[PDB]
Structures are given as structure tokens and as C-alpha cells.
């Protein structure tokens, strides 16, 4: 359902052989800053006439090897031709280069072979329906048929608004203009109305065989300079405001593709969210490619493809089609802001709530305070299932770790029925179906602390029944507690928790106020306590997060 | 009226007549739709002759929309047949084919495919009523999916000129684009049988659309659209059918009547200097019935300093099927600056460079001087034999007579003169800015010369000057002004 299928880059700079799936809206990010920039340049060379005329240098070839040929192919999908207007744009120019047998697909390729004597390898653009017999894109002079289809707008991080406005002023009443024109000449008559015009001529005439020297603008009219005025960081957003209005009117007849590199540069965090809303929520930017290091620039992300360039020197690329389902729509904004910062990390530990974050932040601080520097990240997920977070992180090649409590949820409208919520979420990551809800018989005289302890006994009983299902969880880096985190914490530092709280049952007291008591616990936690919790088998997720 | 015509954005069927009303409205309708539509879709205008396509392209201006302006044959060739013939029929068929109109006539559609597949040329059908190129183009569209996708993606509306000359195979393709591909069609044609038809013309397909088509929106064009309202009122009052369309105006200024009391040259000086109702810098032309009446007026004005050149009606100036083409052959023979490409542009279809060289060889026999009447007739038959057009006996003698003498040279001269005098039959076609006529020429009581008078009145564009030589002429005006209760229809000096 997207015109842009995938792009292939062969032997171009650090790209040995890289295949990346695509969509209308694409966002690229990762550690390799060189790979992200070369990715945008590889798209410009294929589609931007100004950057393509310069040809390939020796450095652009992969590993500076001129024998290997540079090849950049863009695969397109024309299946939605019946209801896509921009698809008909491409068809009208391609004409007979398509075949009816493969009418759904169309290829746009860039081939380059290097000449030693000419010290210069030219760029030959081919297209066609079949990848085997691509034909040269027809052209006459400095323009070809491809330049009539696609117009590439590259938004530099740093831009002067007055300079770009001078480019758009020309194309963007008459009886009124005539009065302004005659009045413009009225300026020059009053300016001359005098001692300098006559003395510079007497000096010029003796020097060289009328020197009036009027004033600019009045010669060419008021339209020559019409720079804007509002009523550094603020004017950057007005340049985007010009781009939206300009490109639609100027390039309505062709497909416009935006290449936005690092737009968060010299931009406030609040404006980054404003730009993110305009990129995804608004239909103003139909097709763009975005390179960003800013998590706040993805707060409003939806219906986009996320491309992650790996930190390795091989320049491996992992792409994910990020789409928020309608069921998650009521918590979409909360979910995106938490996941946006996790895309840039290397290992993400899925925790439930803030009480786990308060504990883990203190424990990690004593054991390994540089865990975020090396790519670790604590992502808290509350109320929702793990599938949306795991699918996005898995496709992007990000190591995901899950630590959740074994919980039971009472079904509404019926008493005595409890859903196996803790197991179902871990089973959902493995693709298995939700387990049947169970009914446990608790007497009416058993309430409060006595009631909770009996429910814990069912959790331990349920945990033992699915002993093999837990075995599959550990292979998938899923860590399901027997009862909950507080009981696993008691197993690691029971002597410390009893001394810290002086209460004979520290687990019961910790769960009274989970946030406050966890803060009270971490304040009195010893350094050996943090190492004991870290080294304990029940907390293997902390060892997997640091990556030892 | 015309404002109601251009506003319609759907399928438009236009009935055009009297000439030039079709071309000006077509160019204005095209450039107006280009301004309204900002999307990537383009328009396509098709004309039978290459001159009409070049005439439309010059008035439109820049075609940065990718709009196609060309010949009917060149359209289906460059947009349908050549791009998608290999998709429709396989890789066996060539896309570098060369279409020759005169050579390689065949009997069956299967035979022509072999000429294109093996002999690498696109030949015409032997039957004039059946078109092979349009039968091939329609067949290619049905066979090729990409061909249908490209036509829909490229053009949103198609303009067609002189639709009454379109054959049935040519008509089937246009209806296929409207019915199946849902492409808007702007159709311009003449419902009257007239004199000029393309060799495979069938007026019934055009007439059938006027009668039974619910999709098209029918419109009509005024015959004297270019003439001003005052001249239209004076012209339409002489014929009963035309008296109903004109509407009275409170003030009449364009039509001037002056009784001829002073000599002819003095009336010209009186209108030019004493009242200044005629400008000497604007083109002025005078109407006569016979050649002798023009000679005596031309000679009388040479004595008074007035300089004039008089165009006489040629033997070819006659309503015949090949009159228009025969005159162009004379213009190529008489004038050296008239190129052979200008002559080929008048020929129907987009002739190839090789076919142009063969036609040029036949006509080069007429460029030698003093080769008598017999050889002119054979060159003419040889010329029209290639075009598969028979020639009327009187058309041959009319062509021959013009070739012998230099008497009718300026009538076919490429140069243009400001002040002229023409006969009513001399410029039955072309229109002039300001015209002066005399009343004694036309018998108005018995309507013998009312048709020649109506033509005389419709030639003037801005200002018409009538001399009231005949009392019976003025009586017919005053009598009908009382029947219609018209106080003023004429401005008298």
C-alpha cells in the first residue's frame, strides 16, 4: 500500500551490500553517524539533479576500490494505481518503460563504472519494469525524465530564511501596483533634489574621459527585496512554514520527497515536538526521510518506518514499520514518549512501574553506573501488553529484556474469578494464546493480609505447573517472578530487608506503599546489598542489561 | 453563450460553423482549463491537418504541462502504438516502425500485422472507410494494461477538431477513451455536410452523437461571432431566418450610411478626414460585384494619390471538394518563400520525410516554365493519385488556367497589403476589418443578391460603411424597420 518498497545500496562508501525496506515516511537513526549521512546522500545521488551532476569520486566507491561498481536501486510499488494520484504521476512519465506482466512493480536504478584515465565515473540512471533489462532514463541535456517525476527538497539543519525566501518570492492589485510603481520613481526625483553628484563627476571626468548614483530597489521596483518581518530559533520554524506552502503550490505536478537531516539542531525541545506532530499527524509531509538523534522528535510518530543503523563498521541496517493499533490509541501519546528514548539504546529492560525503576536505578548505580553510556535503558510499561514494545525493538535489532510480576486480575461482574495476567503477557510474546481464566475459592472470613497470602500460594502453585513454559521464557530473555518482585528481593537480601525495616515481614510492609517504602529501602541499602541483588540468580535481567 | 461553454467541465459537444469560430474558442477553452487545473494531468488536442495543430500551438504559448498538440495520426502513433505495441503483441513487433500512408495497402487486418511484423512498416487500409492505425491503437489498448494506465494517467481531457470528418475506426477510439477510460472529450465539428471531408469521413457518427448521446452536453456557436453587434444587426435583417436572432440597441455607431453624391474618391476623403469614421492607417477594402467595377474604382483612386492593389477571384475560388488543397499547390508554385513543408502541413496526416520527398518530386515538374496545358494536367493527376483523391474536370482546368498566367498571382501571394479592393466572391472566406459597399449592386426586393449581400456585410469586422445608391435598397430597410418597429439600425452622415 506504499509506493516506496525498498532501496538497495551496493558498493557505495561504507555500504558494501545493504537492503532497506521503506515506506512513505522514513526515520533513520543509530550510532553510525557516517552511515546515516551516506544514506541520505545515496538517495540524493539517485534523485537530486544538482548532487548527481558532480558524479562519483574515487572516495565514493566502497573501500576506495574503483573495480567494484556502485549500484543504487529503488524498488517501487504501483499496485494502488487506481486510487493513488501520485502513482499516476509516475506512470505518465514512464510511458512504455513498463510491461503489463509486471505492472505492479517499477525499478529506478543508478549504475556507475569508474574510468582510470578520465579519473571520473559518471552516473547512469536506468529504469524499467524488469530488473534484468533496465533501460536508460531518457534525457536531453542536463535534465532527464526522472527529474520531471521527483523533486527532492533537502532541508539543511542550518538555514537562512531570508535567502530561501528570495528563491520563492518570484512565483508566489494592478491599479494598486501602478501607484506603488510611480511612487517608487517619485523617490528618485526627491533624492536628487545634489552636491555630491556634481563633484564626483568633475573628479571622474578629469580621471577618465553623468555620475548621479541613485539608490537600489527604486531601479528594479519594490519586489526585488521583500524580506519578512514578524509581529534565531523562532525563524527556523517559519522557514518550515514557508516550505509547506511553497512546495505544494510550486511542485503540485510532481512527487516531492523531503530529506530532513538532524532538524533538532539549534531547536528547542518544545519545537521538536511541534515539528514531530507536523511530520506524522499532519498530511503536509507525504514523503520524507528523517535523520535524527532526538527522542523528542518521535513523540508523535505513527505510520512510519524506523530504520536503525547498527554501531558496527559493516553498516548493518534494520528496518521496522512502526504502526500504532487502534486498541492502543487511547494511550498512544504516553506509549510513544516512553518508547522514543528506547529506540536509541542498545539493550532495553522492560519494567512494570516506577517502583521497579527506583530500585533498579539505585542498584545499577552502585554496581554499574555507566550502564546507559554503554547502551542500556530502563523502559517502564504499565497496563499495556509487551507485544508493541517487543516487536519494535526486535525488528530494529535491539536486545529486549522483560521482568514482570506473576499477577492475578479479578474479572469484573464476577467474584472468585482471577485472570492469569502475569503469564498471559509472557505467553503473548511467544505467540501462544491467552490461557483460560481460573477460579479460586477463598472464604469470606479470609480478608486483607490473610487473603493476599493465599493468593500468593496459588501463584507459586501456578508457577510450578508451568515449569517448562518458564523455561522457554528464559531463552527469550523473559523473566517471570514466582510471586512478584518484592518476594524475589527478599530472597536476595532477606537479612538486609529485615534489619532495614525492623518489621518481621518486610515484604508485606514494602507492598503497603510500594513507592514510598521502596524509596525508604534504597536509602538504607548497603553497597554489598546492591551487589548481592545484582549477583542473585533471580535478578539475571540486570546482568543481561549491562551486557557482561 | 461562449461564457456558458467554457464553464462546463464535462463532456462538451460543440457545433461550429462559418469558420474561425471553432479555432479561437478551442484555444481559449484549452488555455482556460490549463489555468484552472493545477494537477499533473495534461490535455491533448488533435487536428486532421498539421497546419491547424501548429496554429493552436502558437496561440497557446508554453506547453510545460506536457500537453500534446499534433495530428490525429501522430497522436495514436506516438502515444499508443509505438510505446505499447511490444507489450500488446510481444517482442516480435518493432517500435522503430515507419508509417507510410501511400504504400502497402492490404485487404485484411491480419495482413497488415505481417507488414508491421516482418516488413517493419505501418501501412494504410485499402478501404477508405476503415482506418488501420486507429484499429491497431484500439486493439493495443485492450491488449496492454500499461497502455490503458498511461493514457488515463497522462490526459484528463482530449480536444478534437473537425469531428465530422472522423471515420468510424477513428470514432471508436475516441468513444473508447470516454466510455472505458472515462476521459473528458471536447468535440468541435460542423453538422452541415459542406464541401470538405477527409477521404474516410462519415458525418453520421457525429450526427448520431447529437441525437442519441446522453453523456455529452450540446452547444452551438454563432456564425458571425467575430463581427460586432451593430454589424450583426445590419447583416441579419435581410434574411428572414436571421432576423430573429438580432436584438435592437439604443445607439448604433459601427454601421455608417452615406448617399453617393460626390465622386467615389471624394467619399473616401470625406469619411477619412471630415468625419474620421475610417482610419487611413487601418486596413480598408471596397466591395464590387464584377471585375470591371473594381478596375474603374482602382484607376480613379490612383489619380487622387490613393494606392491600391486589387485581388481578383480565381477560377479555383469555387465550392469544390479539393479547392482548399488546390490553392495551396498554387501558392507553393507561385511563391518561392512558401516552403514544401507548409504545403505538406495542409495535407491530412503527418507525412514522413521520405513521403514528403516523393510528393516534392511530383510537384517539381510544375516549377519549370512554359510547359503547356497537357503536362500540368498529368502532374496534377499524379499528385492526387498518391493521395487517393480523384479530381473534378473543372478543378483541373481551373488549376491549369491559374498556372499559365500571372493574372491571379497576387491572390495567392504570401505578402499582405493594408489597402485592397476585393470582389464579393474573391474573399468569400477571409474576413476584413473595415469594408465599404454600394447599394446599387444588390437587388433587395426579390432577394436575388441577398446571399451575396449577407456575405458582403459579414466581411466587415469593426466598422461597416454602406453607400445608399439604390432607392429600392433604402426602401427595403425602412419597410422592414416598420415591420420590426426599429427606430435606428443605421447611422447616417
Swiss-Prot record, chain A:
Pfam families: AAA_15, OLD-like_TOPRIM. SUPFAM superfamilies: P-loop containing nucleoside triphosphate hydrolases (SSF52540). It comes from Bacillus cereus (strain VD045). The lineage of its organism: Bacteria, Bacillati, Bacillota, Bacilli, Bacillales. Homotetramer. Forms the core of the anti-phage defense complex. Interacts with GajB; 2 GajB dimers dock at opposite sides of the GajA complex to form a 4:4 GajA-GajB assembly (GajAB). GajAB interacts with Bacillus phage Phi3T Gad1 protein; this interaction forms a 4:4:8 GajAB-Gad1 complex and leads to GajAB inhibition. CDD domains: TOPRIM_OLD. ATP binds at residues 33-37. The N-terminal ATPase-like domain seems to have lost ATPase activity, but may still bind nucleotides. The C-terminal Toprim (topoisomerase/primase) domain probably has the endonuclease activity, but when expressed alone (residues 348-578) has not activity, showing it requires the N-terminal ATPase-like domain for function. Optimum temperature is 37-42 degrees Celsius. This is Endonuclease GajA.
UniProtKB/Swiss-Prot annotation, chain B:
It comes from Bacillus cereus (strain VD045). SUPFAM superfamilies: P-loop containing nucleoside triphosphate hydrolases (SSF52540). Disulfide bonds: none annotated. The record marks 146, 149 as: Interaction with GajA. This is Gabija protein GajB. Disruption phenotype: When this gene is missing the Gabija type I system does not confer resistance to SpBeta in B.subtilis. When this gene is missing the Gabija type I system does not confer resistance to T7 in E.coli. Component of antiviral defense system Gabija type I, composed of GajA and GajB. Expression of Gabija type I in B.subtilis (strain BEST7003) confers resistance to phages phi105, phi29, rho14, SpBeta and SBSphiC. Expression of Gabija type I in E.coli B (strain ATCC 11303) confers resistance to phage T7. May be a helicase or contribute to GajA activation. The keyword Aminoacyl-tRNA synthetase does not apply.
Amino acid at each position: 500500500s506504499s509506493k516506496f518498497s525498498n532501496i538497495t545500496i551496493k558498493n557505495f562508501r561504507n555500504f558494501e551490500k545493504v537492503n532497506i525496506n521503506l515506506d512513505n515516511k522514513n526515520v533513520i537513526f543509530g550510532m553510525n553517524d557516517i552511515g546515516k549521512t551516506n544514506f541520505l546522500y545515496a538517495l540524493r545521488f539517485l534523485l537530486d539533479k544538482e548532487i548527481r551532476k558532480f558524479g562519483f569520486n574515487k572516495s565514493d566507491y566502497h573501500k576506495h576500490d574503483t573495480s567494484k561498481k556502485i549500484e543504487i536501486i529503488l524498488t517501487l510499488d504501483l499496485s494502488n494505481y487506481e486510487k493513488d494520484e501520485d502513482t499516476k504521476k509516475l506512470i505518465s512519465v514512464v510511458k512504455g518503460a513498463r510491461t503489463s506482466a509486471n505492472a505492479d512493480v517499477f525499478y529506478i536504478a543508478l549504475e556507475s563504472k569508474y574510468d582510470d584515465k578520465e579519473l571520473y565515473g559518471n552516473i547512469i540512471l536506468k529504469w524499467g519494469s524488469e530488473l534484468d533489462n533496465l533501460i536508460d532514463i531518457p534525457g536531453r541535456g542536463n535534465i532527464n525524465a526522472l527529474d520531471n517525476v521527483f523533486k527532492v527538497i533537502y532541508i539543511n539543519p542550518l538555514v537562512d530564511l531570508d535567502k530561501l525566501f528570495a528563491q520563492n518570492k518570484k512565483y508566489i492589485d494592478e491599479g494598486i501596483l501602478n501607484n506603488i510603481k510611480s511612487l517608487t520613481d517619485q523617490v528618485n526625483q526627491q533624492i536628487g533634489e545634489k552636491g555630491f553628484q556634481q563633484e564626483i563627476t568633475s573628479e571622474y571626468r578629469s580621471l577618465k574621459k553623468s555620475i548621479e548614483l541613485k539608490s537600489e530597489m527604486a531601479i528594479k521596483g519594490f519586489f526585488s527585496d521583500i524580506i519578512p518581518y514578524i509581529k534565531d530559533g523562532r525563524r527556523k520554524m517559519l522557514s518550515y512554514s514557508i516550505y509547506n506552502y511553497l512546495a505544494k503550490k510550486k511542485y503540485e505536478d510532481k512527487i516531492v520527497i523531503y530529506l530532513i537531516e538532524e532538524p533538532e539542531i539549534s531547536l528547542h525541545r518544545s519545537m521538536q515536538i511541534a515539528l514531530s506532530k507536523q511530520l506524522f499527524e499532519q498530511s503536509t509531509y507525504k514523503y520524507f526521510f528523517l535523520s535524527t538523534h532526538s527522542p523528542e522528535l518521535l513523540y508523535e510518530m505513527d505510520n512510519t518506518r524506523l530504520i536503525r543503523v547498527h554501531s558496527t563498521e559493516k553498516v548493518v541496517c534494520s528496518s521496522h514499520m512502526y504502526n500504532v493499533e487502534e486498541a492502543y490509541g487511547s494511550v498512544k501519546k504516553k506509549l510513544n514518549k516512553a518508547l522514543s528514548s528506547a529506540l536509541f539504546a542498545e539493550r532495553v529492560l522492560l519494567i512494570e512501574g516506577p517502583s521497579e525503576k527506583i530500585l533498579f536505578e539505585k542498584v545499577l548505580d552502585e554496581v554499574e553506573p555507566e550502564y546507559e553510556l554503554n547502551g542500556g535503558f530502563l523502559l517502564e510499561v504499565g497496563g499495556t501488553y509487551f507485544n508493541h514494545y517487543v516487536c519494535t525493538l526486535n525488528d530494529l535489532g535491539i536486545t529486549h529484556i522483560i521482568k514482570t510480576d506473576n499477577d492475578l486480575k479479578s474479572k469484573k461482574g464476577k467474584k472468585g474469578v482471577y485472570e492469569l495476567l502475569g503469564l498471559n503477557r509472557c505467553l503473548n510474546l511467544l505467540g501462544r494464546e491467552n490461557l483460560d481464566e481460573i477460579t479460586i475459592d477463598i472464604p469470606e472470613d479470609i480478608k486483607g493480609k490473610k487473603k493476599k497470602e493465599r493468593l500468593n500460594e496459588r501463584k507459586k502453585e501456578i508457577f510450578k505447573q508451568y515449569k517448562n513454559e518458564v523455561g522457554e521464557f528464559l531463552g527469550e530473555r523473559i523473566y517471570l517472578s514466582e510471586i512478584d518482585l518484592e518476594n524475589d528481593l527478599y530472597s536476595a537480601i532477606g537479612e538486609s530487608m529485615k534489619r532495614i525495616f525492623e518489621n518481621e515481614d518486610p515484604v508485606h510492609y514494602l507492598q503497603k506503599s510500594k513507592l514510598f517504602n521502596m524509596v525508604e529501602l534504597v536509602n538504607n541499602l548497603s553497597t554489598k546489598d546492591c551487589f548481592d541483588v545484582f549477583e542473585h540468580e533471580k535478578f539475571a535481567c540486570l546482568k543481561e542489561l549491562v551486557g557482561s | 453563450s461562449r461564457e456558458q461553454i467554457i464553464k462546463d467541465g464535462g463532456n462538451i459537444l460543440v457545433t461550429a460553423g462559418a469558420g474561425s469560430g471553432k479555432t479561437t474558442i478551442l484555444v481559449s477553452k484549452i488555455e482556460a482549463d490549463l489555468k484552472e487545473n493545477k494537477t499533473h494531468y495534461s490535455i491533448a488536442a488533435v487536428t486532421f491537418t498539421n497546419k491547424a495543430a501548429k496554429e493552436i500551438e502558437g496561440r497557446l504559448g508554453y506547453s510545460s504541462r506536457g500537453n500534446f498538440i499534433g495530428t490525429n495520426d501522430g497522436f495514436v502513433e506516438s502515444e499508443i502504438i509505438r510505446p505499447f505495441i511490444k507489450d500488446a503483441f510481444g517482442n516480435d513487433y518493432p517500435d522503430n516502425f515507419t508509417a507510410e500512408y501511400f504504400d502497402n495497402q492490404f485487404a485484411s487486418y491480419d495482413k497488415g500485422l505481417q507488414v508491421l511484423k516482418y516488413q517493419n512498416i505501418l501501412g494504410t487500409y485499402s478501404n477508405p472507410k476503415k482506418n488501420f492505425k486507429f484499429q491497431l491503437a484500439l486493439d493495443i489498448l485492450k491488449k496492454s494494461l500499461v497502455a490503458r494506465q498511461y493514457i488515463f494517467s497522462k490526459y484528463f481531457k482530449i480536444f478534437i477538431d473537425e469531428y465530422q470528418d472522423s471515420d468510424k475506426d477513428m470514432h471508436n477510439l475516441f468513444m473508447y477513451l470516454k466510455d472505458q477510460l472515462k476521459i473528458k472529450l471536447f468535440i468541435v465539428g460542423d453538422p452541415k455536410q459542406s464541401i470538405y471531408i477527409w477521404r474516410g469521413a462519415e458525418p453520421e457518427n457525429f450526427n448520431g452523437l447529437i441525437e442519441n448521446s446522453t453523456d455529452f452536453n450540446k452547444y452551438h456557436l454563432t456564425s458571425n461571432f467575430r463581427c460586432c453587434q451593430d454589424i450583426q444587426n445590419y447583416s441579419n435583417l435581410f434574411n428572414e431566418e436571421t432576423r430573429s436572432l438580432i436584438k435592437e440597441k439604443n445607439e448604433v455607431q459601427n454601421v455608417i450610411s452615406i448617399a453617393d453624391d460626390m465622386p467615389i474618391s471624394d467619399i473616401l476623403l470625406k469619411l477619412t478626414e471630415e468625419k474620421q469614421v475610417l482610419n487611413i492607417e487601418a486596413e480598408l477594402v471596397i466591395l464590387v460585384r464584377r471585375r470591371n467595377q473594381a478596375i474603374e474604382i482602382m484607376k480613379e483612386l490612383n489619380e487622387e494619390g490613393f494606392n491600391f492593389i486589387f485581388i481578383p477571384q480565381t477560377p479555383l475560388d469555387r465550392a469544390t471538394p479539393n479547392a482548399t488543397l488546390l490553392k495551396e499547390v498554387i501558392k507553393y508554385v507561385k511563391n518561392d518563400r512558401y516552403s514544401i513543408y507548409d504545403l505538406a502541413a495542409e495535407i491530412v496526416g503527418n507525412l514522413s520525410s521520405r513521403e514528403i520527398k516523393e510528393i516534392q518530386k511530383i510537384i517539381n515538374e510544375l516549377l519549370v516554365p512554359n510547359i503547356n496545358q497537357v503536362l500540368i494536367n498529368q502532374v496534377l493527376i499524379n499528385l492526387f493519385a498518391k493521395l487517393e483523391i480523384t479530381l473534378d474536370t473543372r478543378e483541373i482546368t481551373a488549376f491549369t488556367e491559374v498556372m499559365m498566367t500571372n493574372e491571379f498571382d497576387i491572390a495567392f501571394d504570401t505578402n499582405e497589403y493594408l489597402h485592397k479592393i476585393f470582389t464579393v466572391h474573391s474573399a468569400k472566406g477571409l474576413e476584413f476589418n473595415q469594408v465599404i459597399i454600394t447599394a446599387s449592386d444588390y437587388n433587395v426586393h426579390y432577394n436575388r443578391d441577398t446571399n451575396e449581400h449577407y456575405v458582403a456585410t459579414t466581411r466587415a469586422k469593426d466598422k461597416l460603411i454602406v453607400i445608399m445608391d439604390n432607392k429600392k435598397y433604402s426602401d427595403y430597410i425602412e419597410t422592414l424597420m416598420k415591420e420590426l418597429k426599429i427606430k435606428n439600425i443605421i447611422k447616417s452622415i
